[PDB]
């Protein structure tokens, strides 16, 4: 969980996290509060998963587009600044961080892609996309390339798509229409087709990512690149004399870059909400603090008017703002994440030749407008399949509760719980969604495949492997008091007396234990033997209230023999046999193994508990889950 008295921050690695750490050091010098600054990979995906359970950071930094999804899930706490403080920042930045009338994060600064070019290779850089191909032929002859930039994230490739009319969500009459998506209209098709034509003309490489392009440009091996303010510092250090200029225009229209607002939200499970208020308002959002972060890796056009007016004189900031005005500001709705995913796959597949432009955008079109609840159920059941291998242990209520958490809506009313069930059933009916190929569980020597976990479904007969591993779990839950003989013990002892099991207990002195559990597998029926070592009693459990008279006699002969061969003759005598009364009793012929495992569990744990034949569907699911966890359910 989250520690109290310490502030812990997440911010992406391409920002000035060291510069922010200097701000935290001052906070610690003036208040005694340690401030930790971490930059985990994939932190935007992580923050939901951990903030749901109370863990995670005190403060979360990301472009505003993600925060809708967080506020939808109750993960962000409401920002409460003075009107005095709110006047200090440009109003349209507070717009980026307002979700359904509430403020959910502090704006920090404004980001937009621009065209960064090598002044010495290319004193006059192209104004249009269309003239770049010939330029690249002219430079490749000189030994170097025209352009390189990140082709693995769609934020970089989007402006070309949106130039001739690509868009994400129609913004009409104040609201975003999430059913009207512009990722396969002919303008977006036009943009991406021009791009993939560059890949097929060997003017750019389809595998280029952020690191490759940055190295190319800063080493002077390529004359142009596309990036944000954060890149500039690493070029100040390089060989290159660079400028920041307007992006080229595709089909006479400006490239529309999506504009992000770096925003610091607050975890709703944070015990340090006041501390984060103080840090963000009075240390970070000052001229001094933004200066620190800006010097490590630039922020761009900061929200704090006072410092922005001092930075605005920079030609690079001016260029970034020009590109911003020609673009469109990112939405902050929860569907934005689903939009970005859809486009990332479409670009990568189109440039890799695995899909056409028209088909990749056909796919992205449907996914970006997909019903949010449906895709959530898809993800939940896919994760469940990866964890437990099948949907055998799945409870419908389980899915219902997860959805209630995510969307902060009710789902248990009949009309809604029924929709959840229908979605689950459609998921199950698709191919490959039944079980995981090669799914495995490994606990010490034991191994279970889906052929073993399958015996827990419905009214199937549990097999030897399931029973033996679950017994080892019961024993290892209280191992100084319990020892568990596997199912093969009894058949040997019955046939060949003590000599067939005389080497069974390797180094185990069963007579220092309190309880020994011995399953009894005959044909298809499972029974159980329970030895109370302290009281020297042998006791036979049958879920059908039928005693096997010879079984406890075999057990008794074995126990005396073991007392002889282990020099434990103080345990040689006093044994009495019992047929157990007042326990659960099956009505069918097929739940016997489960009855026995439950008997064992509640003999070992000695907690108040009862169950019945009618509890068996629940308990079967529970046993499955305990096995996969390699832990019993306390």
């Amino acid at each position: 969980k989250i520690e109290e008295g310490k502030l812990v921050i997440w911010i992406n690695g391409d920002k000035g996290y060291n510069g922010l750490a200097e701000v935290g050091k001052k906070f610690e010098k003036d208040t005694g509060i340690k401030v930790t600054v971490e930059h985990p990979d994939k932190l935007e995906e992580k923050f939901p998963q951990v903030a749901a359970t109370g863990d995670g950071p005190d403060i979360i930094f990301w472009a505003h587009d993600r925060f809708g999804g967080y506020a939808q899930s109750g993960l962000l706490a409401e920002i409460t600044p003075d009107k005095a403080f709110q006047d200090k920042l440009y109003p349209f930045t507070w717009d980026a961080v307002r979700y359904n009338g509430k403020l959910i994060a502090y704006p920090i600064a404004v980001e937009a892609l621009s065209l960064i070019y090598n002044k010495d290779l290319l004193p006059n850089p192209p104004k249009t996309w269309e003239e770049i191909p010939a330029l690249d032929k002219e430079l490749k002859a000189k030994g170097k390339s025209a352009l390189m930039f990140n082709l693995q994230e769609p934020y970089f490739t989007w402006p070309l798509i949106a130039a001739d009319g690509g868009y994400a969500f129609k913004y009409e009459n104040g609201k975003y229409d999430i059913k009207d998506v512009g990722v396969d209209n002919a303008g977006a098709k036009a943009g991406l087709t021009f791009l993939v034509d560059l890949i097929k003309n060997k003017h750019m490489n389809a595998d280029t990512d952020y690191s490759i392009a940055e190295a190319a440009f800063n080493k002077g091996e390529t004359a142009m690149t596309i990036n944000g303010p954060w890149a500039w510092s690493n070029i100040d250090t390089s060989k290159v004399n660079y400028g920041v200029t307007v992006l080229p225009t595709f089909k006479g229209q400006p490239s529309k870059p999506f504009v992000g607002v770096l925003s610091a939200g607050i975890n709703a499970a944070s015990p340090n909400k006041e501390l984060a208020k103080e840090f963000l308002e009075n240390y970070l959002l000052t001229d001094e603090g933004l200066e620190a972060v800006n010097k490590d890796k630039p922020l761009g056009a900061v929200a704090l008017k006072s410092y922005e007016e001092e930075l605005a004189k920079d030609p690079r900031i001016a260029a970034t703002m020009e590109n911003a005005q020609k673009g469109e500001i990112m939405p902050n709705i929860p569907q934005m994440s689903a939009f970005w995913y859809a486009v990332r796959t479409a670009v990568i597949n189109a440039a890799s030749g695995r899909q056409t432009v028209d088909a990749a955008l056909a796919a992205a079109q449907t996914n970006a407008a997909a019903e949010e609840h449906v895709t959530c159920v898809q993800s939940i059941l896919d994760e469940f399949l990866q964890t437990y291998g099948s949907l055998i242990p799945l409870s419908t209520d389980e899915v219902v509760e997860k959805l209630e958490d995510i969307f902060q809506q009710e789902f248990s009313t009949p009309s809604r719980k029924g929709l959840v069930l229908q979605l689950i059933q459609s998921y199950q009916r698709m191919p490959g969604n039944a079980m995981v190929r090669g799914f495995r569980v490994a606990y010490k020597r034991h191994v279970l495949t889906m052929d073993d976990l399958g015996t827990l479904y419905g009214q199937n007969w549990l097999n030897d492997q399931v029973m033996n591993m679950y017994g080892d779990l019961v024993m290892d839950t209280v191992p100084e008091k319990v020892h568990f003989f596997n199912s093969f013990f009894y058949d040997k002892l019955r046939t060949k007396g003590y000599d067939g099991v005389k080497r069974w207990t390797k180094n185990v002195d069963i007579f220092n234990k309190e309880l020994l559990l011995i399953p009894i597998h005959l044909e298809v029926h499972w029974s159980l033997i329970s030895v109370d070592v302290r009281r020297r009693t042998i006791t036979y459990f049958d879920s059908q209230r039928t005693l096997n008279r010879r079984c406890p006699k075999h057990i008794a002969k074995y126990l005396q023999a073991e007392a002889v061969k282990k020099d434990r003759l103080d345990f040689h005598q006093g044994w009495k046999g019992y047929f157990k009364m007042n326990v659960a009793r099956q009505n069918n012929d097929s739940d016997s193994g489960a009855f026995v495992l439950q008997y064992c569990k509640h003999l070992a744990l000695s907690q108040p508990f009862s169950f019945t034949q009618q509890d068996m569907p629940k308990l079967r699911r529970q046993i499955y889950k305990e096995l996969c966890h390699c832990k019993l359910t306390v």
Partner: peptide, 18 residues
């Protein structure tokens, strides 16, 4: 050698080990 018990006796039933 098996024995079925019709009802549920009050306490557990002591049985022979020899």
């Amino acid at each position: 050698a098996f024995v079925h018990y019709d009802k549920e006796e009050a306490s557990d039933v002591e049985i022979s080990l020899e």
